[PDB]
Amino acid sequence: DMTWEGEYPPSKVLGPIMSKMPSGLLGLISIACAAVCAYSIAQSGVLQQQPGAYENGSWVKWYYVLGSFGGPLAWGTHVASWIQRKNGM
């Protein structure tokens, strides 16, 4: 079923949604998830060192925690972008 041969897996290993998505759309989503994660890490760094914004864990923001998990989503969408490009989308 999900066994494959050759240099690249087929599109169906991406699930039922990303197997139909273009490689350029998955590539641009990946940069968008990487930039949101890099912004969330950098802004949580400056919230840690701000002397009125770190006490009792006030440096933790929900949108920066949720934004930082674009990191593993940027990894996966750029892997998925490569697989759709090798499969001709």
Partner 1 sequence: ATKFPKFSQALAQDPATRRIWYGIATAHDLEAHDGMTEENLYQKIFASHFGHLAIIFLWTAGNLFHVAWQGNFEQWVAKPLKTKPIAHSIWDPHFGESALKAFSKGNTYPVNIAFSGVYQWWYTIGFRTNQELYAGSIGLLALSCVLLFAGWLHLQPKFRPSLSWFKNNESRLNHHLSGLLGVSSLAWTGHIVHVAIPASRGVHVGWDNFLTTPPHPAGLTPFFTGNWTVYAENPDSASHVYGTSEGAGTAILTFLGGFHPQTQSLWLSDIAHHQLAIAVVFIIAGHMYRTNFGIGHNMKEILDAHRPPGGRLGAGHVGLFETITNSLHMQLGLALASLGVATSLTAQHMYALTPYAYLSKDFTTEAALYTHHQYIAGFLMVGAFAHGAIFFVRDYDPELNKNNVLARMLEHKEAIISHLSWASLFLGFHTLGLYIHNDTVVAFGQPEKQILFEPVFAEYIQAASGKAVYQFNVLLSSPTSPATVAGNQVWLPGWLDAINNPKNDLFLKIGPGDFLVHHAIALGLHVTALILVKGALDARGSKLMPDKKDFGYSFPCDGPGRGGTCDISAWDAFYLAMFWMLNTIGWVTFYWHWKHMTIWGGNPGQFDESSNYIMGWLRDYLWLNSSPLINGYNPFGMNNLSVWSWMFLFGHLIWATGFMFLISWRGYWQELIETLVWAHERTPLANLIRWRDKPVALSIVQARLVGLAHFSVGYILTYAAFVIASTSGKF
Partner 2 sequence: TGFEEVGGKPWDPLSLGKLEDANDTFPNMFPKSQYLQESEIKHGRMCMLAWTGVWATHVGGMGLGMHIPGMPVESDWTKALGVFAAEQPALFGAILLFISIAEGESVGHSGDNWRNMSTKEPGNLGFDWMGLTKKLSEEKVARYKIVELKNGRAAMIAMASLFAMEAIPGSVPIMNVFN
Ligand X SMILES: CCCCCCCCCCCCCCCCCC(=O)OC[C@H](CO[C@@H]1O[C@H](CO)[C@H](O)[C@H](O)[C@H]1O)OC(=O)CCCCCCCCCCCCCCCCC
Binding site for partner 2 (CB under 8 A): 7, 82, 85
d(CA 39, CA 3): 38
Say how many C-beta atoms besides its own lie within 10 A of residue 14's C-beta.
21
List the single partner that 79 binds among ligand CLA, partner 2, ligand X, none, CB under 5 to 8 Å by kind.
Answer: ligand CLA
- What mask, x for binding ligand X by CB under 6 A, covers residues 10 to 49? ------------xxxx--x---------------------
Give the torsion through C-alpha atoms of 16, 5, 86, 29, to 10 deg. 40
CB of 28 to ligand X, least distance (A): 5
Name residue, tokens 């009125």: 52
Q: Which residues bind ligand X (CB under 6 A)?
A: 22-25, 28, 89
